[PDB]
């Protein structure tokens, strides 16, 4: 088979992640169409409909019945390389696959860096305000 870390490349696996997805039959953003777009379901108490791309790790919420997951992706973050692969997974060469997976590993790092950066700016804002308050 294929080891877990690589399962997200499998459409059927992505589909599987949508448990209690509200947008079903009749909707443009079905679990099938979401998966075809590269999304997996990453629900939180806070954001129950939160989906994330497995490749570029971009995250979208506030989904609506008529949303085309593909056009949503292309619109909010076009740079994602998964979008550009029209080949079927198993028609891919191992070189092509490992190439992609390299870029995913890259994207992942980028994602984590941007996150560290955001919480840095957040704690900064807090020390700043505290300092201001004391100054008063």
């Amino acid at each position: 088979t294929l080891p877990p870390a690589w399962q997200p490349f499998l459409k059927d696996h992505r589909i599987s992640t949508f448990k209690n997805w509200p947008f079903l039959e009749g909707c443009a953003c079905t679990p099938e169409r979401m998966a075809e777009a590269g999304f997996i379901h990453c629900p939180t108490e806070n954001e129950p409909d939160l989906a994330q791309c497995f490749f570029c790790f971009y995250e979208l919420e506030g989904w609506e019945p008529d949303d085309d997951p593909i056009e949503e992706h292309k619109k909010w973050s076009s740079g994602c390389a998964f979008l550009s692969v029209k080949k079927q997974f198993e028609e891919l060469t191992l070189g092509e696959f490992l190439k992609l997976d390299r870029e995913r590993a890259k994207n992942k790092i980028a994602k984590e860096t941007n996150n560290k950066k955001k919480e840095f700016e957040e704690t900064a804002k807090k020390v700043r305000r505290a300092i201001e308050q004391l100054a008063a």
């Binding site: 953003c29 954001e47 939160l50 989906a51 971009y58 995250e59 979208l60 919420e61 506030g62 989904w63 609506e64 949303d67 949503e72 909010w76």
Partner: peptide, 4 residues
């Protein structure tokens, strides 16, 4: 949809 929209970013978070």
């Amino acid at each position: 949809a929209v970013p978070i």
